[PDB]
Design a protein around this ligand. Structure first.
Ligand SMILES: CC(C)CCC[C@@H](C)[C@H]1CC[C@H]2[C@@H]3CC=C4C[C@@H](O)CC[C@]4(C)[C@H]3CC[C@]12C
Ligand SMILES: CC(C)CCC[C@@H](C)[C@H]1CC[C@H]2[C@@H]3CC=C4C[C@@H](O)CC[C@]4(C)[C@H]3CC[C@]12C
Ligand SMILES: CC(C)CCC[C@@H](C)[C@H]1CC[C@H]2[C@@H]3CC=C4C[C@@H](O)CC[C@]4(C)[C@H]3CC[C@]12C
Ligand SMILES: CC(C)CCC[C@@H](C)[C@H]1CC[C@H]2[C@@H]3CC=C4C[C@@H](O)CC[C@]4(C)[C@H]3CC[C@]12C
Ligand SMILES: CC(C)CCC[C@@H](C)[C@H]1CC[C@H]2[C@@H]3CC=C4C[C@@H](O)CC[C@]4(C)[C@H]3CC[C@]12C
Ligand SMILES: CC(C)CCC[C@@H](C)[C@H]1CC[C@H]2[C@@H]3CC=C4C[C@@H](O)CC[C@]4(C)[C@H]3CC[C@]12C
Lengths: 214, 1164, 218
């Protein structure tokens, strides 16, 4: 069959800048009729994909003018000039000329901006969970940037626990910041055995609480 | 050759040329009308396909295109009306001028030219040629120019929208045009193929039909039938082969059409998917170029019709080149004033141009003073009638110079000379008008007082007094209503009303009795004193009181002087005077019942043909649907390929189906025609003589019905079934599918369907013609035209060209006005239908636009409904145009059933009766009376009686028409008399076997006729149901003294003789009639005019076989030559049917009666 | 507009079968080509099926051919994907998509419905409230949480106050571990809101018909 590979997988563009994605197939994409069928789709985080260009140069209804697609032979590139923060997302190139139709993949776009520190907040295990013999302390690290940040759990002031669970949201379309959550889960007995629980974002940002119930 | 194009339109006035120019322009517009509609249609489907966007302004755009459609339609309405009307008008006026000129050109003509030319050609050539010229210069030329303009307009519109697709359709366009042309020419009313095939066979028919009585005399009713049947099977086979070829070519055309659909849609989808052209663009290009290439085919039959018109017009222009060499109306002739009775003939040599090799006249010199009654005597053959004809300027003499009172005829006026010479010919003819007009035909201004004095001079007032309508009686054709004496007397009157200067009688008292001839001759001497008179007659009673008597010998006048001068001259005249002193029924299917399988196969294929137009529509719609829906390219491509392949398979199915349907119906139709013709011919032979007596059935009914029965009955059954079945299938299933896809639109369109169907019918019927069924309208005119030929012998006394021409033009006046009116009407109808097509397109698609706007039905569904119903209606009309008419067929089939049922108790096919093993040969008539069935009022017999014994040479002497051949026909079981008793050896013929009597005896005919074979088969015809030995052939040939003329001919006993022996001479065919009768060896022998045309040395060698063979058989000879009468045993003389004298010859010679005046004619 | 809603996604055992449906409104269903597209948990899309407008032609790739089937009712305006002989490489999110003119393949997409194929068993979640200790305030704003934990399969719905709270929310994507999923969320409201009026954490796990509304308590 025919494979499509994007040249960049991830691209970091500051607001107002311009950049280009290139989608190279191995076999030349030319139908029997003569038309060439290449489409570029964009999927924003948490949304279904929307069509961007429906033939190498054309544009779907409503598409902003700053998207510009140009394609020569077997090399095809879509370039966006002065990309807005809303337009970030994942880009795919679809080819429907030969009897198997395949998508490209990749092309992550990350808008650059000023660094932000997270509004960290830690939460104590709920009564309902302690009853069932579990204790999970959660620390949210909301609205920061860049993505790379470290969280370190401290139990009773010294115990750097590592049995946590971490997850990242994707860059927010509104303010281009990140969030992420760190959940420290253990037994009700191992939790009762201590009093002070500290969350540290990494001049680290600390948050802590002192009890088993308040 | 053929005429020039320019001479064809010679009689056309400047007004008719204006008609032609405007008609050409109208046809060009009307032709450019259709491809423009297809252009609009392409654009309209392009709009409809974009109507549903992810419905706004649909109704508005469809309003615009409905206006475009309606405008094109109205323009076409105007153009169609103009184009039809102007051409029909121009052709009509020109044909009126041509008929007048033709009838007038034939009037002058030439003396004897009419005898040369055929009578049937002069009456037939006229109507056929003129009706064939009308068709060539009529609307056919207009349609040809319409087709040319349509072709050019289609190609131009196609080339303008898209050139790539039109290049391919052009690549295949020659084959499309050839196929359309060959399809149309076969389909262009191919009734001429049957007349070509039956042409041979038909001939044989008429031969029989020429002489039925002779075919009755010899046993050939059964023998001719086989000769007729064997001739028929060949035409049957040739016809079956012709039907196979026609259907093959038609089916091949259909295959080619559908293959072009498939190719165009394959390549057009390839173009649309690539973005080169849109869909409506493809539809426009394709339909325009197809319609143009298909109209090139419509152009062809008109080209053939034009050539045929030229061919038939050549002869008529030749007729107007004819010159009589006598100017009946050049007023440059010289007219005397003091016309005095005087005749001058000197060194007058003249011969007939019909037979110029023989010279009858070798000079005659005569000088006749005023009031000199000159009679000329001589045997028939010297040219008494010739001098008469050579007296009234009929012919001019080759040598000498003839004068009348000083100056010669060759410088004075012929008409003025012709009016002043009252002449009665030998056998006068009488115009079939009232008797007041007949006697009026002498001159213009005659009142009834001069009439009465004239008829009282003619002594023809008694029979005027007795009959009703004493001046209003319409005398029948050729003087059949009245008697001959009354006829010849009023003919004398008709001559006397001219009040002439020179009177010329020619056998004026042929059939007249004593007293009327006496009073006629006294009236002739009553009015002879102021005039010069020449009288020719056979009775010497009216001759002895003349001024001068003379005698012809070999064309030269020899004896001159008075009565006593020729008495002391002792010549031939002294020898003469010395010797003188409804129901209507339906049985047609049963006639073809036997051929049940063919129909079955046929019916099946017909069903499938009905299903070709709906199915097409479905496939058609879906392809356009494929480009209306929203699919990826690959789906469009593979669906489009599927549907194009379906088109190809549909074409192949149509090919096979047409082939099978045509083949089976043609096979059954030809077998039906063969069986039917055979049966009708057989029944005609079986019919009685009385059935042949009726003048409707004498020549033309029997001949016509045999060709009219074949062509029609097949249309009565096979064509009816095929057309009804195919139309019902087509229209029914198309309407049903349309009902299911949309019910409102189907009802809307059903309101309009009948107009489209009848439109197609009108179109095709325009191509075929009007068939000229105007014998009723042209009836009086044709009567006048025939009676001018009939009375051509009476034209000699008074030409009366102007009178006949006025009667004929007055006859023509009504059809001319009627025809102009009819042309207007036909233009209006043709135009209305041709426009209603485009109006229907407009209305259907506007209503459909409303429907799509409210999502009641899809665009593909309205397109399917429209295509199916419209194209089905067009095909329905087209199919109903090819079918022949049921009414003509039904009336023919009824006539035929009537013919077959007829049975006059001929009793020829039955054995029953009295069959004695033995006979003697004695005949006894008693009190036998006979009246003709066609003349029930006139008796020709008044109860004769006769006694004939063995070997009794019985002579029957009488006048011409006193029941001479009647006794022959009484014997030969032709007529059975109403009263009387005939004993054949004490055996009444009414109780015997019928064929036994016709077998035993054998006669010779009054005229010898043979059959279309050699002379061996001529004589072999005498003996039937018997192995004919050739030793009897050559023995009879020697006995008849014809052996020498047969052995002298190359391929002696295989020499092919034509019809009625028209190759060899009269004496020789009379002798071979002697030989043909001789092989019968009859116990009873009858001769009727055994020496009518024969030499004096051949009469003896004929009679020697008779004399040696008259023993043992009864012999009865009827003749005018006394040579066989002197040696006869007994002699019977007749007078109006009554036996006056009988007995031995010496007894009648002893008692001087009418037989003494009979025998003493030219002897001494 | 153009509305595509697909449904019929659940948990099925490997080698079993399942049937998905997609209802479409706002356009003529019988005039458009319809496709089914699949997205794996590795964020790589893949084409799955395509059916023409009449339903006569059907195109599958050389990876599910003979196992899957696609069908269509134009009278009810429904699109059906019948599946059979499933596999571990079919756990993915399925979209129904529409076909645009001018040769664009996917114009309108559905919402997506998830399909999991394995040998695990349905497990309801465990919703836990999250509030700062003793209702301690963070100035003019307060941040509340909620934690669902130990459920299977993935599809879970979390809202606040039936969707009245939507402004400052933070739902975090589910992390799989030990064949169990874990998900959390935060909301930030002014101090004058939460102690003043309670905030309810609405949670719904359709796989187990579980639906619980947990109020946040100081
Ligand atoms: C009697 C002879 C001369 C008939 C001539 C008909 C010729 C001119 C027709 C028949 C088929 C046609 C060709 C069919 C296909 C093509 C391919 C296209 O890309 C260019 C035009 C071209 C090449 C057409 C040119 C015109 C064409 C060649
Ligand atoms: C009697 C028979 C053999 C005559 C048939 C002549 C016809 C069929 C020939 C003459 C020119 C030919 C065409 C010339 C060019 C093209 C363009 C090509 O892309 C498709 C085939 C097509 C459309 C050809 C089809 C066949 C063709 C139309
Ligand atoms: C002069 C006349 C006979 C020429 C007509 C030739 C026609 C019948 C030929 C020329 C090209 C052919 C087509 C070319 C390709 C295909 C694709 C196939 O999947 C279905 C049949 C179909 C559509 C063929 C049908 C027959 C076809 C249309
Ligand atoms: C009076 C009778 C003959 C009418 C029926 C004629 C038949 C042969 C016509 C009527 C409807 C037509 C069918 C309707 C549409 C289709 C579907 C298509 O995918 C294949 C062809 C096919 C199947 C057509 C073939 C021809 C067809 C079946
Ligand atoms: C020679 C004379 C009788 C004219 C015949 C021409 C034919 C084509 C005319 C005469 C009567 C007409 C038909 C009269 C009635 C109908 C029923 C209608 O629902 C469909 C059209 C249809 C079937 C007409 C079609 C055209 C028609 C058949
Ligand atoms: C030969 C005869 C029957 C032709 C008559 C054509 C008529 C009936 C067609 C032509 C245009 C059509 C109309 C076009 C627009 C409208 C407006 C809509 O709100 C009611 C239907 C109506 C009024 C249609 C009814 C049918 C219609 C009137």
């Amino acid at each position: 069959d025919v494979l499509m590979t994007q040249t960049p997988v991830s691209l970091s563009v500051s607001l107002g800048d311009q950049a280009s994605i290139s989608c190279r197939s191995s076999q030349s994409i030319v139908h029997s009729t003569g038309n060439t069928y290449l489409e570029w789709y964009l999927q924003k985080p948490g949304q279904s994909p929307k069509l961007l260009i429906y033939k190498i140069s054309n544009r779907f209804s409503g598409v902003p003018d700053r998207f510009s697609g140009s394609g020569s032979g077997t090399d095809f590139t879509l370039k966006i000039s002065r990309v807005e923060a809303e337009d970030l997302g994942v880009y795919y190139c679809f080819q429907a000329s030969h009897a198997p139709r395949t998508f490209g993949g990749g092309t992550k776009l990350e808008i650059k901006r000023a660094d932000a520190a997270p509004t960290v907040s830690i939460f104590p295990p709920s009564s309902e969970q302690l009853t069932s013999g579990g204790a999970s302390v959660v620390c949210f690290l909301n609205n920061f940037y860049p993505k790379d940040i470290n969280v370190k759990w401290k139990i009773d002031g010294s115990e750097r626990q590592n049995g946590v669970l971490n997850s990242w949201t994707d860059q927010d379309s509104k303010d281009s910041t990140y969030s992420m959550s760190s959940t420290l889960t253990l037994t009700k007995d191992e939790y009762e055995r201590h009093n002070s629980y500290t969350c540290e974002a990494t001049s680290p940002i600390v948050k802590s609480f002192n009890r088993n119930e308040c | 050759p053929t005429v020039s194009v320019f001479s064809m339109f010679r009689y056309s006035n400047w007004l008719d040329k204006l008609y032609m120019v405007v008609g050409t322009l109208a046809a060009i517009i009307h032709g450019a009308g259709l491809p423009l509609m297809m252009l609009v249609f392409g654009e309209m489907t392009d709009i409809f396909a974009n109507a549903g966007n992810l419905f706004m302004n649909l109704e508005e755009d469809m309003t615009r295109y409905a206006y475009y459609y309606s405008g094109i339609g109205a323009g076409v309405l105007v153009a169609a009306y103009i184009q039809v009307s102007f051409w029909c008008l121009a052709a009509g006026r020109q044909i009126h001028k041509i008929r007048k000129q033709f009838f007038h050109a034939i009037m002058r003509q030439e003396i004897g030219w009419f005898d040369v030319h055929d009578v049937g050609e002069l009456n037939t050539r006229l109507t056929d040629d003129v009706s064939k010229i009308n068709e060539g210069i009529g609307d056919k030329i207009g349609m040809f120019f319409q087709s040319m303009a349509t072709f050019f307009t289609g190609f131009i519109v196609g080339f303008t929208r898209g050139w790539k697709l039109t290049l391919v359709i052009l690549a295949i366009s020659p084959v499309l045009g050839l196929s359309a042309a060959v399809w149309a020419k076969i389909l262009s009313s191919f009734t001429d193929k049957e007349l070509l095939a039956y042409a041979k066979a038909g001939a044989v028919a008429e031969e029989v039909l020429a002489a039925i009585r002779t075919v009755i005399a010899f046993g050939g009713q059964k023998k001719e039938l086989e000769r007729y049947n064997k001739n028929l099977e060949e035409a049957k086979r040739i016809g079956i082969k012709k039907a196979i070829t026609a259907n093959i070519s038609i089916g091949a055309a259909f295959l080619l059409i559908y293959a072009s659909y498939a190719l165009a849609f394959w390549y057009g989808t390839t173009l649309v998917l690539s973005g080169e052209y849109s869909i409506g663009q493809v539809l426009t290009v394709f339909f325009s170029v197809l319609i143009g290439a298909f109209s090139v085919g419509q152009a062809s039959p008109s080209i053939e019709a034009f050539a045929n018109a030229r061919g038939a017009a050549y002869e008529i222009f030749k007729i107007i080149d004819n010159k009589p060499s006598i100017d009946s109306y050049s007023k440059s002739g010289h007219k005397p004033d003091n016309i005095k009775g005087n005749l001058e003939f000197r060194n007058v040599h003249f011969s007939y141009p019909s037979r110029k090799e023989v010279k009858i006249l070798k000079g005659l010199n005569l000088k006749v003073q005023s009031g000199q009654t000159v009679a000329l005597v001589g045997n028939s053959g010297c040219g008494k009638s010739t001098t008469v004809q050579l007296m009234q300027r009929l012919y001019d003499p080759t040598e000498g110079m003839v004068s009348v009172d000083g100056q010669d005829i060759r410088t004075i006026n012929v008409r003025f000379l012709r009016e002043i010479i009252g002449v009665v010919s030998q056998e006068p003819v009488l115009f079939a008008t009232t008797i007041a007009e007949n006697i009026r035909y002498g001159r213009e201004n005659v009142t009834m007082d001069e009439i009465e004095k004239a008829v009282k001079e003619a002594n023809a007032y008694d029979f005027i007094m007795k009959l009703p309508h004493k001046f209003d009686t319409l005398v029948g054709e050729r003087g059949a209503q009245l008697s001959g004496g009354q006829k010849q007397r009023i003919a004398i009157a008709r001559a006397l009303v001219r009040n002439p200067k020179i009177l010329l009688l020619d056998e004026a008292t042929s059939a007249l009795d004593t007293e009327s001839e006496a009073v006629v001759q006294v009236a002739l001497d009553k009015a002879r004193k102021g005039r010069t008179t020449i009288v020719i007659a056979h009775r010497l009673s009216t001759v002895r009181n003349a001024d001068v008597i003379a005698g012809f010998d070999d064309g030269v006048i020899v004896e001159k002087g008075n009565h006593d001068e020729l008495m002391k001259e002792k010549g031939i005249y002294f020898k003469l005077v010395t010797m003188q002193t409804p129901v209507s029924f339906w049985r047609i299917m049963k006639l073809n019942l036997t051929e049940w399988p063919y129909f079955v196969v046929g019916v099946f294929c017909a069903i499938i043909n009905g299903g070709l137009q709906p199915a097409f529509a479905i496939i058609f719609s879906k392809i356009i649907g494929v480009f209306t829906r929203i699919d990826d390219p690959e789906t469009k491509r593979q669906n489009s390929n599927l549907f194009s392949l379906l088109f190809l398979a549909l074409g192949i199915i149509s090919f096979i189906t047409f082939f099978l349907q045509g083949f089976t119906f043609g096979k059954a139709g030809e077998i039906l025609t063969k069986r039917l013709r055979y049966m009708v011919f057989r029944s005609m032979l079986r019919q009685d003589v009385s059935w042949f007596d009726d003048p409707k059935n004498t020549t033309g009914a029997l001949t016509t019905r045999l060709a009219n029965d074949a062509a029609q009955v097949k249309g009565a059954i096979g064509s009816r079934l095929a057309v009804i079945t195919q139309n019902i299938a087509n229209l029914g299933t198309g309407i049903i599918i349309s009902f299911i896809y949309g019910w409102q639109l189907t009802l809307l369109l059903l309101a309009i369907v009948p107009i489209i169907a009848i439109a197609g019918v009108v179109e095709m019927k325009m191509l075929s013609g009007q068939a000229l069924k105007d014998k009723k309208e042209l009836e009086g005119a044709g009567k006048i035209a025939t009676e001018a030929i009939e009375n051509f012998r009476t034209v000699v006394s008074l030409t009366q060209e102007q009178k006949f021409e006025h009667m004929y033009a007055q006859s023509l006046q009504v059809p001319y006005r009627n025809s102009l009116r009819k042309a207007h009407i036909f233009g209006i109808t043709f135009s209305f239908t041709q426009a209603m097509m485009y109006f229907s397109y407009a209305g259907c698609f506007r209503f459909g636009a409303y429907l799509v706007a409210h999502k009641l039905m899809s665009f593909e569904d309205v397109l399917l409904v429209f295509s199916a119903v419209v194209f089905g209606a067009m095909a329905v009309g087209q199919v109903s145009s090819f079918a022949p008419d049921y009414a003509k067929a039904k009336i023919s089939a009824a006539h035929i059933i009537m013919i077959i049922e007829k049975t006059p108790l001929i009793d020829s096919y039955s054995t029953e009766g009295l069959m004695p093993n033995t006979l003697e040969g004695n005949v006894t008539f008693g009190e036998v009376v006979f009246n003709y069935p066609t003349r029930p009022d006139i008796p020709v017999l008044q109860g004769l009686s006769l006694e004939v014994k063995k070997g009794q040479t019985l002579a029957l002497v009488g006048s011409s028409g006193c029941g001479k051949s009647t006794v022959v026909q009484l014997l030969e079981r032709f007529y059975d008399p109403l009263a009387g008793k005939v004993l054949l050896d004490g055996k009444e013929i009414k109780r015997l076997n019928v064929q036994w009597l016709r077998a035993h005896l054998g006669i010779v005919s009054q005229e010898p006729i043979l059959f279309d074979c050699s002379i061996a088969e001529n004589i072999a015809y005498g003996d039937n149901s018997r192995v004919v030995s050739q030793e009897e052939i050559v023995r009879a040939a020697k006995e008849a003294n014809i052996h020498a003329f047969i052995e002298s001919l190359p391929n002696k006993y295989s020499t092919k003789v034509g019809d009625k022996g028209t190759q060899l001479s009269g004496g020789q065919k009379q002798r071979i009639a002697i030989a043909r009768a001789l092989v019968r060896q009859p116990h009873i022998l009858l001769l009727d005019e055994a020496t009518s045309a024969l030499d004096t040395e051949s009469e003896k060698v004929v009679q020697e076989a008779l004399d040696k063979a008259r023993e043992g058989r009864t012999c009865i000879v009827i003749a005018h030559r006394l040579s066989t009468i002197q040696n006869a045993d007994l002699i019977v003389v007749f007078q109006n049917g009554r036996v006056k004298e009988h007995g031995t010859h010496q007894q009648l010679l002893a008692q001087k009666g009418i037989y003494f005046s009979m025998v003493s004619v030219q002897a001494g | 507009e153009v509305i595509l809603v697909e449904s019929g996604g659940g948990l099925v055992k490997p080698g079993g079968s399942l049937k998905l449906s997609c209802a479409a409104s706002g356009f003529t269903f019988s005039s458009y080509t319809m496709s089914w597209v699949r997205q794996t948990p590795e964020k790589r899309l893949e084409w799955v099926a395509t059916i023409s407008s009449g339903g006569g032609n059907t195109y599958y790739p050389d990876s599910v051919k003979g196992r899957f089937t696609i069908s269509r009712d134009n009278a009810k305006n429904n699109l059906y994907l019948q599946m059979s002989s499933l596999r571990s490489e079919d756990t993915a999110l399925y979209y129904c998509a529409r076909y645009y003119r001018y040769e664009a393949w996917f114009a309108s997409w559905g919402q997506g419905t998830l399909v999991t194929v394995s040998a695990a068993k349905t497990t309801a979640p465990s919703v836990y409230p999250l509030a700062p200790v003793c209702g301690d305030t963070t100035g003019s704003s307060v941040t509340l949480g909620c934690l669902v934990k130990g459920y299977f399969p993935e599809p879970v719905t979390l809202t606040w106050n039936s969707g009245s709270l939507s402004s400052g929310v933070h739902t975090f994507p589910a992390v799989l571990q030990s064949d169990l999923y874990t998900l959390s969320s935060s909301v930030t409201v002014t101090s004058s809101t939460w102690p003043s009026q309670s905030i309810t954490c609405n949670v719904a796990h359709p796989a187990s018909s579980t639906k619980v509304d947990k109020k946040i308590e100081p």
